[PDB]
C-alpha cells in the first residue's frame, strides 16, 4: 500500500540528517500557527516516511520535533464535519493511511524519539505514541491527551490501540480515552504516558539525540522495538481471554451505562468496543478495527453536533465573536461583591482564584465572614486532595476581604451585586455604594428574572450598569450570562466579557428581556417535568427521562434546587404583564399544590424529594397519591423529546426576538448554563441535528414537533422561522 | 405422527459446591455411570437401536467440551452408531434435550433416543465458556446485559414480594424435598455415584439443609458474590424499567438455587421401538413449546412458554395435575404462581433447586424425571414442566402418565 | 406429519486462516449479517412466527460461547420469543441444525425455524473447547483416540488410494469450484461480509487456489501440523488394525480441507407457515439419518449414514441426482465414491472444502445451500448431503426440489 491518499499541497515537514545518521523531522505547517493533521500533513509525512525507508542504510535514529509553540494539536475538523455516510470509504482510507505512516515509523528497526515542546493533543499525541521514547518539556500551558471523545469521535490515529497496548483495557479507557483527559507534563510522566522531562525546550533535541546514541549502545537488539512488538508480550491486566479480566469484563458496559445515565452518546461505547475488540487480535488488525469504528462515528450526526458546538462554536466565542469591535482592554484592580450568599461567596471565590482582590460586603460582618468560609471549605477540600499548595491556598484566601461597611468599597472598579431578588432592594443596595466606588467602576447585577433596564434606573452612571448572571455552584458552572441593558455601553460589555475569560469562564452576550435566555429556557424544561407529574406520569419515569435525555441532573431534583417559591414568583411576574387574560402553563397548578403542602424545595427541607439530615434521600412517597401517578404512561421517548423540544423551541424564539445574536451563544449558552445535553450540540443545534423515526434534519425536527403538538399541546408547534 | 414415550428417567445425586463429594468425579463419569445403570435395568436391550444421545451442557469447555455426549457413547462402550450431540440453551438444556429427542422420535427418522444433561459446576464454573452477550462490549451495551440475580430482585420489586415472602418459599422447598427423600420418593430414580473400586462417593443431595428455620433464613445477607456485586447493573435494569425507583434486593443464598454437580438421563422412544425391546412406557410427551419474554428481567420466560404449550395440547391449568418450575430464584416461582393462578399443592410438590441444587445442564432432565415418578406414585395424569432461561427464554413440556 | 421445506439458504464467503479477510469480524457478526440479509429479501415477514434459531458450533468458547444462537437473536433485533440454541456434532453440526430444525417442524410443535452454523477458526482455533476424549488419559487410552488426518491416511492405505489418486481429486475440487464461481452459480447465495459502515470486507472464497497444478500438489509434504507430528498415533491405529503393517501418509495441505472462517443460515418451515408469510419453498426435506462406524478410523461414517437415509426415503443410489460429501480429506470422498459406486458427474459438482474451506460449525448448512441452488440450476430433482464426523459418526440428508 501507500503512505499517501490518492492513487498540490504545501510541505509541512523539514528534513535534517546529521553526521551520525539521525534524521530530525521538524513539523512546521506554514498555513497556521499550529500543526494540524490536515491533507498537507498527510502528504508531507508520506514523503518523509518514504524517504526514511529509501535511505534506511544511512539512518540510525529519528527525532520528531516541532517548530511551533505547541507540538501538534488536533485534526482537520473543517473536513471531518462534512463527512456524509456515503463518504465512509474516504474516511476509512484516510485514517488507515495516517496509521500506516506511523506504523512504518514505529517498525523502522531504529529508535524514534518524540521531542514534545508544547501541547500534544489529539492526533499530536498519537504521533508521539508511535515513537519509542517521549521527552517532554515541563513548561506552562503544555498539555497531553486524546480528547476526541469530547467532539464525539475517538482517537483514530492509533490512540485507542496503542494506549491499550501500553496500559491495558481498563486503565487506558478510564484514565485516558473515555473522558479525553488532558495531562500536564509532570502528570503525563507519572502515569507512563511520557518517559522523561526536561527543563527547557532547547534541551529537547539534544536530549533526544543523546537517548538515541545511548539506546543504540546499551540495547542494540531492542532498539526501535515497541513492547507489544516483542515476542512474549503480556498486556497489562490481561487480554479478554484472560480469566482475571474476563471476570470483570461484563461490568464495563454496565458501568459505562451508569456513568452516561443511558444517554445516546455513541462515542464512549465505540471507544470501549474498539478497545476490547482490538485486544483480542494482533496490532495491525486492532488498528483496522479502530478505523472502522472511527468512520462509524464521523459519518454519524452526534459527532457533527459535538464538532459544531465544542470546536467551532466554542472557538468563535473565545475569539470575541460576541465582543463589540474596536473596544480595548481595561484592567481590574479591586472587585466588590455585594451579598455573601452562596452566589456572592462563589463569585468571590472564582475571582480570588484568578488573582483578583475581592471585597465581600454583606449587611453584617458575621454574614460576610460566613461567605468567605465557603472559599475556606473549598480550599481545604483541594488541599486535602493535593490539587494546590499551602502557599497558593493562603494567598487566595488573603485576597478575599469580608466587610459590612459601605466605605470599604473604596478602590473597587468592578461591582458584582448578588443580593436578594427584588428591584427596590437592588436600587437601595447600589445607591449606597455607587458614590464610593471608582468613577469608571462596572456596576454588575446577578439577577435571574428582573430586567436589567429596570435595575439600571437606580444608578446615575447607567452606561456602566450591566447584568452579570452567574450559575450556582459558581465554582463549577462554566457560563456567565452577560445581559446588555438598553443603556449599557459597548465598553461595559467588553469589560465584563474580558473579566469572564480572565476568571476561566465562557461568556454569552444577551439583549435585555424578561427571563433573559437561560432562566427563560430552563423554565420550559422544568415546566415540562411538572406538567407530566400533574398528568399522572410516574415520578421515577420523569427522572429517568431527564437523565436518559442527557441532562446532568433530572428535572424534579432540579426544581428542588431552584425552589418552587422562586418559580411561582416568575409565573405571577410574567402574568402581571399579560394581566388580556393570562395563558398559564400546566405546571403552574403543580407548583401551587406543592407550595400549599409545604414542599417548596431543598431550601425548605421538603420538595419532590425527601431531605433527611443534609443529603437528598429518595422521592417523597406521598408524591404518587397527590398527583395520581401511574395513570398516564406515555412512551419514554415522548417524555425525553418533550423536555428537549420545549427548550429547543424556546431557544428559537429567543433567536427570533433578538435576545440572542448567534447560534453559537445559543448552543454554548444552553450547554454550559442550563445543562443541555452535549450530544445535541446545544439547544439550537438540536434542531438541525435532530434524528428520529421521522428522519434527520430540520424538517424531521418540524415533523416531530407537530406530532408532539398534536399529542401534548400547541406549545410544541414550531415557529414560522423553522419552516420552508 | 408417532407418539414419543418416556421409558426411563434416572439422575445422580447433586453434590454441593464447597467440599463437594462429586468434585473428584469427571462429568464424563457422571454420565457413564447412568448409562451403566440403564444397562443394569435392561441387560437384554439391543443398543444398536439407539440412534442418538442428546446431552445438555451450559459450559461445554474443558472436561465438558468436545461433544461430551459422543464421549459418553464411546466411553461406555455403546455402539458406534449411537450418535452423540451436545446442546446449550442455558438452564433449559436438559429439558431441551428431552424435547428435541421427543421431536426426533415424532418425525419417524429416529427410533430410540437417550436424552439428558450434565453440569459439574465445581469443576467447570458457569461462565467458563465466555460468550458474546457478556464479554463483547458492543452487544453487551445493546442487549442491556444484567445478571439473573438482579432480574429476580426486580421481579420481587414489581410484584411486591417481600423478603419474608421469598424466604417463606425457600422454607417450603426445604421441607418438601426433605419429606420426599425420607418418604422414599427418590429411592428408585437417584443412582448413587461410586468410584472405580465400587466405593460409595455420594448417594444423597448434599446441598439440602433440612433443618432450616425462618429465623435462620432472615439472618442471611443479600447476594454479593460474582457479577451481582460488580456494579452498574442495578442502574442498567432501571433504565429499561424506568417506572421503578429502587430495586428491593431480597434474594440470598437461602432462597436461590444452589450450585451443585449432577447428571440426568432419559430414554425416549416410539411405541413400536419400546414394544420391540420389551420396555414398558412410563409417560407420554404431549407437547413442547419454546418462547420468551424481556431479556433484561430475564426470568419471565416460563409464563408465555407455559401458555403456549397449553394451547398446543388443548389444555388449561385445570387439566394439569402437577406444576414443576425450576427454583432458580424464589421470586420466579412466585411470579409464575401469581400469573397462571397455580394452587400451592400443585407446585413443585417434592422441593426444588433451592433445596437440592441446580446443575445447569442437567436440571431440566432431573425435574422431568421427578415428575415422571410423582405422577406414577400419586396415580395422577398430567404434569407441566417449565424453566426460566437466561436471556429471557422459556421452555415448557406436558407429560401424560401411561 | 408436517412436511418441512427449505425457503432460504444463504452463506458468507469463506475467509482464509493466515491473513484472512474475516479475521477482524466477530463470529456473532457473521451470523447477524446473514439475518439482516433475510430481512432485506423478505421485509414484510412477521418475525414473530420464527420460534427457534438453531446454530451449529464446534468450539463454542470465547467469542462463540454463551449460546451464540441466542446472542444472534438478541443482537439482530429479532423478536424475543424466537429462542436460540447452540449444538455441536463436530463437522456435521451445521447439517445437524438443519435436520433438527426440520424435525421440529415435522412434529408440529414448531412453526418457522432458522438453522445454520458459525465458525471463526482464525479467532477460535480447533480444539479451543478442550474435550474429555482427548484431554483425559483414562478415556483417551480406552477409546483409541487418533487424529482425523491419520484415519484418512489409514483409509487410503486400506483402499489403495495413492498419493496421485488423492492429489488428482484435490485438483478436481479446485477446478469445479472455480468453474462454479466463474459461471455465476454462487451469485445469489454468497452474501458478502460488510462492516458497520457498509464497506466491503470479503466477497469471495479467498482460500481457493484455482491455478493449482498436478506438479505443484506433488511437491507438498505430508501433514506436519499439530496433533500429527506428535508420536504414538501411528502405532495406536495399527494396534487395532493389526493386519496393516504400515500407514501410507498421502494427505497434505493441498488435498485436505482448509481452515477458514464463515457462517450459513437456512430457513425451514411448514408449507402453511411459508404460505402465510408469502415465502416460496425451494426444496423439501425428505429424510434424515444418523449412523456411524469405527471411531479409530473416524472417517468411514458417511457410508452407513447414506444407506440408512436412502432406505428410510425408499430410494436407491440411482434415484439421487447430486451427491454432496464434505471434503475433509480426499481419501474419504474416494472411499465413499468407491463403496456406493457414485458416478463422478454427481459428486461435489461445485467443488468442496479442499478448495473453498471448512468452517466446522457452518459447513453442513453451507453445502446444503449449495445443493438447493444447484438443483434449481440443473432443474434436477434429488440431492443427498452427507458429512464424515469426528469420533466415527455420520449424518446424511435427502432433499427434493419443489
PDB file of N, CA, C and O in Angstrom, chain C residues 53-102:
ATOM      1  N   UNK C  53     -34.037 -20.517  16.691  1.00  0.00           N
ATOM      2  CA  UNK C  53     -32.831 -20.342  15.887  1.00  0.00           C
ATOM      3  C   UNK C  53     -31.805 -21.345  16.398  1.00  0.00           C
ATOM      4  O   UNK C  53     -31.415 -21.297  17.570  1.00  0.00           O
ATOM      5  N   UNK C  54     -31.379 -22.257  15.531  1.00  0.00           N
ATOM      6  CA  UNK C  54     -30.509 -23.365  15.910  1.00  0.00           C
ATOM      7  C   UNK C  54     -29.206 -23.228  15.136  1.00  0.00           C
ATOM      8  O   UNK C  54     -29.201 -23.305  13.902  1.00  0.00           O
ATOM      9  N   UNK C  55     -28.105 -23.022  15.852  1.00  0.00           N
ATOM     10  CA  UNK C  55     -26.803 -22.793  15.237  1.00  0.00           C
ATOM     11  C   UNK C  55     -25.822 -23.877  15.655  1.00  0.00           C
ATOM     12  O   UNK C  55     -25.685 -24.172  16.846  1.00  0.00           O
ATOM     13  N   UNK C  56     -25.144 -24.461  14.669  1.00  0.00           N
ATOM     14  CA  UNK C  56     -24.071 -25.395  14.965  1.00  0.00           C
ATOM     15  C   UNK C  56     -22.765 -24.658  15.230  1.00  0.00           C
ATOM     16  O   UNK C  56     -22.451 -23.647  14.600  1.00  0.00           O
ATOM     17  N   UNK C  57     -21.999 -25.185  16.181  1.00  0.00           N
ATOM     18  CA  UNK C  57     -20.744 -24.555  16.579  1.00  0.00           C
ATOM     19  C   UNK C  57     -19.883 -25.596  17.275  1.00  0.00           C
ATOM     20  O   UNK C  57     -20.272 -26.114  18.326  1.00  0.00           O
ATOM     21  N   UNK C  58     -18.717 -25.896  16.699  1.00  0.00           N
ATOM     22  CA  UNK C  58     -17.903 -26.996  17.209  1.00  0.00           C
ATOM     23  C   UNK C  58     -17.012 -26.553  18.371  1.00  0.00           C
ATOM     24  O   UNK C  58     -16.691 -27.360  19.255  1.00  0.00           O
ATOM     25  N   UNK C  59     -16.612 -25.282  18.415  1.00  0.00           N
ATOM     26  CA  UNK C  59     -15.824 -24.744  19.523  1.00  0.00           C
ATOM     27  C   UNK C  59     -16.571 -23.573  20.154  1.00  0.00           C
ATOM     28  O   UNK C  59     -16.171 -22.410  20.004  1.00  0.00           O
ATOM     29  N   UNK C  60     -17.665 -23.846  20.879  1.00  0.00           N
ATOM     30  CA  UNK C  60     -18.462 -22.751  21.478  1.00  0.00           C
ATOM     31  C   UNK C  60     -17.809 -22.170  22.727  1.00  0.00           C
ATOM     32  O   UNK C  60     -18.257 -22.359  23.861  1.00  0.00           O
ATOM     33  N   UNK C  61     -16.710 -21.440  22.511  1.00  0.00           N
ATOM     34  CA  UNK C  61     -15.940 -20.805  23.575  1.00  0.00           C
ATOM     35  C   UNK C  61     -15.611 -19.383  23.145  1.00  0.00           C
ATOM     36  O   UNK C  61     -15.642 -19.046  21.960  1.00  0.00           O
ATOM     37  N   UNK C  62     -15.292 -18.544  24.127  1.00  0.00           N
ATOM     38  CA  UNK C  62     -14.870 -17.181  23.845  1.00  0.00           C
ATOM     39  C   UNK C  62     -15.923 -16.411  23.076  1.00  0.00           C
ATOM     40  O   UNK C  62     -17.052 -16.218  23.544  1.00  0.00           O
ATOM     41  N   UNK C  63     -15.558 -15.960  21.872  1.00  0.00           N
ATOM     42  CA  UNK C  63     -16.499 -15.244  21.020  1.00  0.00           C
ATOM     43  C   UNK C  63     -17.668 -16.117  20.588  1.00  0.00           C
ATOM     44  O   UNK C  63     -18.705 -15.584  20.175  1.00  0.00           O
ATOM     45  N   UNK C  64     -17.526 -17.440  20.678  1.00  0.00           N
ATOM     46  CA  UNK C  64     -18.563 -18.369  20.260  1.00  0.00           C
ATOM     47  C   UNK C  64     -19.257 -19.062  21.428  1.00  0.00           C
ATOM     48  O   UNK C  64     -20.112 -19.922  21.196  1.00  0.00           O
ATOM     49  N   UNK C  65     -18.925 -18.711  22.667  1.00  0.00           N
ATOM     50  CA  UNK C  65     -19.556 -19.308  23.824  1.00  0.00           C
ATOM     51  C   UNK C  65     -20.865 -18.633  24.184  1.00  0.00           C
ATOM     52  O   UNK C  65     -21.376 -17.763  23.478  1.00  0.00           O
ATOM     53  N   UNK C  66     -21.415 -19.063  25.315  1.00  0.00           N
ATOM     54  CA  UNK C  66     -22.597 -18.430  25.881  1.00  0.00           C
ATOM     55  C   UNK C  66     -23.820 -18.468  24.995  1.00  0.00           C
ATOM     56  O   UNK C  66     -24.572 -17.486  24.941  1.00  0.00           O
ATOM     57  N   UNK C  67     -24.038 -19.586  24.294  1.00  0.00           N
ATOM     58  CA  UNK C  67     -25.171 -19.741  23.379  1.00  0.00           C
ATOM     59  C   UNK C  67     -25.183 -18.632  22.334  1.00  0.00           C
ATOM     60  O   UNK C  67     -25.982 -17.687  22.421  1.00  0.00           O
ATOM     61  N   UNK C  68     -24.311 -18.742  21.330  1.00  0.00           N
ATOM     62  CA  UNK C  68     -24.213 -17.701  20.315  1.00  0.00           C
ATOM     63  C   UNK C  68     -25.484 -17.600  19.479  1.00  0.00           C
ATOM     64  O   UNK C  68     -25.729 -16.567  18.852  1.00  0.00           O
ATOM     65  N   UNK C  69     -26.309 -18.649  19.455  1.00  0.00           N
ATOM     66  CA  UNK C  69     -27.583 -18.567  18.745  1.00  0.00           C
ATOM     67  C   UNK C  69     -28.497 -17.525  19.381  1.00  0.00           C
ATOM     68  O   UNK C  69     -29.089 -16.690  18.686  1.00  0.00           O
ATOM     69  N   UNK C  70     -28.619 -17.559  20.711  1.00  0.00           N
ATOM     70  CA  UNK C  70     -29.445 -16.576  21.404  1.00  0.00           C
ATOM     71  C   UNK C  70     -28.864 -15.175  21.268  1.00  0.00           C
ATOM     72  O   UNK C  70     -29.611 -14.195  21.152  1.00  0.00           O
ATOM     73  N   UNK C  71     -27.533 -15.059  21.291  1.00  0.00           N
ATOM     74  CA  UNK C  71     -26.902 -13.765  21.060  1.00  0.00           C
ATOM     75  C   UNK C  71     -27.257 -13.225  19.683  1.00  0.00           C
ATOM     76  O   UNK C  71     -27.499 -12.022  19.524  1.00  0.00           O
ATOM     77  N   UNK C  72     -27.294 -14.100  18.674  1.00  0.00           N
ATOM     78  CA  UNK C  72     -27.695 -13.677  17.337  1.00  0.00           C
ATOM     79  C   UNK C  72     -29.105 -13.102  17.344  1.00  0.00           C
ATOM     80  O   UNK C  72     -29.357 -12.042  16.766  1.00  0.00           O
ATOM     81  N   UNK C  73     -30.034 -13.789  18.009  1.00  0.00           N
ATOM     82  CA  UNK C  73     -31.418 -13.324  18.066  1.00  0.00           C
ATOM     83  C   UNK C  73     -31.498 -11.962  18.747  1.00  0.00           C
ATOM     84  O   UNK C  73     -32.156 -11.040  18.253  1.00  0.00           O
ATOM     85  N   UNK C  74     -30.823 -11.811  19.890  1.00  0.00           N
ATOM     86  CA  UNK C  74     -30.907 -10.553  20.628  1.00  0.00           C
ATOM     87  C   UNK C  74     -30.174  -9.428  19.906  1.00  0.00           C
ATOM     88  O   UNK C  74     -30.673  -8.298  19.841  1.00  0.00           O
ATOM     89  N   UNK C  75     -28.993  -9.716  19.350  1.00  0.00           N
ATOM     90  CA  UNK C  75     -28.192  -8.661  18.738  1.00  0.00           C
ATOM     91  C   UNK C  75     -28.791  -8.179  17.424  1.00  0.00           C
ATOM     92  O   UNK C  75     -28.595  -7.017  17.049  1.00  0.00           O
ATOM     93  N   UNK C  76     -29.515  -9.042  16.714  1.00  0.00           N
ATOM     94  CA  UNK C  76     -30.100  -8.685  15.430  1.00  0.00           C
ATOM     95  C   UNK C  76     -31.509  -8.127  15.558  1.00  0.00           C
ATOM     96  O   UNK C  76     -32.204  -8.001  14.545  1.00  0.00           O
ATOM     97  N   UNK C  77     -31.949  -7.805  16.772  1.00  0.00           N
ATOM     98  CA  UNK C  77     -33.265  -7.220  16.949  1.00  0.00           C
ATOM     99  C   UNK C  77     -34.423  -8.126  16.600  1.00  0.00           C
ATOM    100  O   UNK C  77     -35.523  -7.636  16.336  1.00  0.00           O
ATOM    101  N   UNK C  78     -34.209  -9.438  16.584  1.00  0.00           N
ATOM    102  CA  UNK C  78     -35.297 -10.364  16.337  1.00  0.00           C
ATOM    103  C   UNK C  78     -36.236 -10.396  17.538  1.00  0.00           C
ATOM    104  O   UNK C  78     -35.865  -9.979  18.639  1.00  0.00           O
ATOM    105  N   UNK C  79     -37.471 -10.863  17.345  1.00  0.00           N
ATOM    106  CA  UNK C  79     -38.400 -10.955  18.473  1.00  0.00           C
ATOM    107  C   UNK C  79     -37.815 -11.809  19.579  1.00  0.00           C
ATOM    108  O   UNK C  79     -37.111 -12.791  19.332  1.00  0.00           O
ATOM    109  N   UNK C  80     -38.111 -11.417  20.817  1.00  0.00           N
ATOM    110  CA  UNK C  80     -37.526 -12.088  21.965  1.00  0.00           C
ATOM    111  C   UNK C  80     -38.135 -13.460  22.216  1.00  0.00           C
ATOM    112  O   UNK C  80     -37.638 -14.202  23.071  1.00  0.00           O
ATOM    113  N   UNK C  81     -39.188 -13.823  21.485  1.00  0.00           N
ATOM    114  CA  UNK C  81     -39.774 -15.156  21.552  1.00  0.00           C
ATOM    115  C   UNK C  81     -39.186 -16.117  20.521  1.00  0.00           C
ATOM    116  O   UNK C  81     -39.760 -17.187  20.296  1.00  0.00           O
ATOM    117  N   UNK C  82     -38.063 -15.769  19.892  1.00  0.00           N
ATOM    118  CA  UNK C  82     -37.505 -16.570  18.812  1.00  0.00           C
ATOM    119  C   UNK C  82     -36.407 -17.520  19.269  1.00  0.00           C
ATOM    120  O   UNK C  82     -35.697 -18.074  18.427  1.00  0.00           O
ATOM    121  N   UNK C  83     -36.255 -17.720  20.575  1.00  0.00           N
ATOM    122  CA  UNK C  83     -35.389 -18.779  21.068  1.00  0.00           C
ATOM    123  C   UNK C  83     -33.938 -18.569  20.694  1.00  0.00           C
ATOM    124  O   UNK C  83     -33.434 -17.442  20.644  1.00  0.00           O
ATOM    125  N   UNK C  84     -33.248 -19.674  20.422  1.00  0.00           N
ATOM    126  CA  UNK C  84     -31.827 -19.641  20.134  1.00  0.00           C
ATOM    127  C   UNK C  84     -31.043 -20.678  20.915  1.00  0.00           C
ATOM    128  O   UNK C  84     -30.874 -20.545  22.132  1.00  0.00           O
ATOM    129  N   UNK C  85     -30.555 -21.712  20.234  1.00  0.00           N
ATOM    130  CA  UNK C  85     -29.840 -22.811  20.873  1.00  0.00           C
ATOM    131  C   UNK C  85     -28.614 -23.152  20.037  1.00  0.00           C
ATOM    132  O   UNK C  85     -28.668 -23.147  18.802  1.00  0.00           O
ATOM    133  N   UNK C  86     -27.500 -23.431  20.713  1.00  0.00           N
ATOM    134  CA  UNK C  86     -26.281 -23.901  20.066  1.00  0.00           C
ATOM    135  C   UNK C  86     -26.143 -25.399  20.287  1.00  0.00           C
ATOM    136  O   UNK C  86     -26.327 -25.880  21.408  1.00  0.00           O
ATOM    137  N   UNK C  87     -25.818 -26.132  19.226  1.00  0.00           N
ATOM    138  CA  UNK C  87     -25.478 -27.538  19.361  1.00  0.00           C
ATOM    139  C   UNK C  87     -24.113 -27.797  18.735  1.00  0.00           C
ATOM    140  O   UNK C  87     -23.516 -26.925  18.101  1.00  0.00           O
ATOM    141  N   UNK C  88     -23.628 -29.024  18.921  1.00  0.00           N
ATOM    142  CA  UNK C  88     -22.294 -29.414  18.473  1.00  0.00           C
ATOM    143  C   UNK C  88     -22.297 -30.912  18.198  1.00  0.00           C
ATOM    144  O   UNK C  88     -22.384 -31.717  19.130  1.00  0.00           O
ATOM    145  N   UNK C  89     -22.228 -31.282  16.923  1.00  0.00           N
ATOM    146  CA  UNK C  89     -21.972 -32.652  16.481  1.00  0.00           C
ATOM    147  C   UNK C  89     -20.763 -32.665  15.559  1.00  0.00           C
ATOM    148  O   UNK C  89     -20.797 -33.205  14.455  1.00  0.00           O
ATOM    149  N   UNK C  90     -19.682 -32.016  16.010  1.00  0.00           N
ATOM    150  CA  UNK C  90     -18.458 -31.844  15.233  1.00  0.00           C
ATOM    151  C   UNK C  90     -18.762 -31.338  13.823  1.00  0.00           C
ATOM    152  O   UNK C  90     -19.654 -30.503  13.640  1.00  0.00           O
ATOM    153  N   UNK C  91     -18.046 -31.861  12.823  1.00  0.00           N
ATOM    154  CA  UNK C  91     -18.138 -31.336  11.467  1.00  0.00           C
ATOM    155  C   UNK C  91     -19.560 -31.346  10.912  1.00  0.00           C
ATOM    156  O   UNK C  91     -19.844 -30.614   9.958  1.00  0.00           O
ATOM    157  N   UNK C  92     -20.463 -32.142  11.481  1.00  0.00           N
ATOM    158  CA  UNK C  92     -21.832 -32.229  10.990  1.00  0.00           C
ATOM    159  C   UNK C  92     -22.784 -31.261  11.687  1.00  0.00           C
ATOM    160  O   UNK C  92     -23.989 -31.296  11.410  1.00  0.00           O
ATOM    161  N   UNK C  93     -22.269 -30.396  12.568  1.00  0.00           N
ATOM    162  CA  UNK C  93     -23.135 -29.526  13.361  1.00  0.00           C
ATOM    163  C   UNK C  93     -24.036 -28.674  12.478  1.00  0.00           C
ATOM    164  O   UNK C  93     -25.224 -28.504  12.776  1.00  0.00           O
ATOM    165  N   UNK C  94     -23.491 -28.128  11.390  1.00  0.00           N
ATOM    166  CA  UNK C  94     -24.300 -27.306  10.506  1.00  0.00           C
ATOM    167  C   UNK C  94     -25.477 -28.061   9.919  1.00  0.00           C
ATOM    168  O   UNK C  94     -26.599 -27.549   9.883  1.00  0.00           O
ATOM    169  N   UNK C  95     -25.238 -29.290   9.456  1.00  0.00           N
ATOM    170  CA  UNK C  95     -26.311 -30.104   8.900  1.00  0.00           C
ATOM    171  C   UNK C  95     -27.215 -30.666   9.988  1.00  0.00           C
ATOM    172  O   UNK C  95     -28.408 -30.884   9.746  1.00  0.00           O
ATOM    173  N   UNK C  96     -26.669 -30.908  11.182  1.00  0.00           N
ATOM    174  CA  UNK C  96     -27.500 -31.383  12.283  1.00  0.00           C
ATOM    175  C   UNK C  96     -28.499 -30.317  12.713  1.00  0.00           C
ATOM    176  O   UNK C  96     -29.637 -30.635  13.082  1.00  0.00           O
ATOM    177  N   UNK C  97     -28.097 -29.046  12.665  1.00  0.00           N
ATOM    178  CA  UNK C  97     -29.035 -27.972  12.968  1.00  0.00           C
ATOM    179  C   UNK C  97     -30.182 -27.952  11.967  1.00  0.00           C
ATOM    180  O   UNK C  97     -31.348 -27.807  12.353  1.00  0.00           O
ATOM    181  N   UNK C  98     -29.874 -28.110  10.676  1.00  0.00           N
ATOM    182  CA  UNK C  98     -30.924 -28.181   9.662  1.00  0.00           C
ATOM    183  C   UNK C  98     -31.838 -29.370   9.929  1.00  0.00           C
ATOM    184  O   UNK C  98     -33.068 -29.243   9.926  1.00  0.00           O
ATOM    185  N   UNK C  99     -31.247 -30.543  10.170  1.00  0.00           N
ATOM    186  CA  UNK C  99     -32.037 -31.745  10.418  1.00  0.00           C
ATOM    187  C   UNK C  99     -32.949 -31.567  11.626  1.00  0.00           C
ATOM    188  O   UNK C  99     -34.149 -31.859  11.561  1.00  0.00           O
ATOM    189  N   UNK C 100     -32.396 -31.089  12.745  1.00  0.00           N
ATOM    190  CA  UNK C 100     -33.217 -30.882  13.934  1.00  0.00           C
ATOM    191  C   UNK C 100     -34.288 -29.833  13.679  1.00  0.00           C
ATOM    192  O   UNK C 100     -35.448 -30.015  14.065  1.00  0.00           O
ATOM    193  N   UNK C 101     -33.917 -28.728  13.027  1.00  0.00           N
ATOM    194  CA  UNK C 101     -34.909 -27.752  12.588  1.00  0.00           C
ATOM    195  C   UNK C 101     -36.014 -28.423  11.780  1.00  0.00           C
ATOM    196  O   UNK C 101     -37.205 -28.212  12.036  1.00  0.00           O
ATOM    197  N   UNK C 102     -35.633 -29.253  10.806  1.00  0.00           N
ATOM    198  CA  UNK C 102     -36.630 -29.957  10.007  1.00  0.00           C
ATOM    199  C   UNK C 102     -37.486 -30.872  10.874  1.00  0.00           C
ATOM    200  O   UNK C 102     -38.709 -30.940  10.696  1.00  0.00           O
TER     201      UNK C 102
END
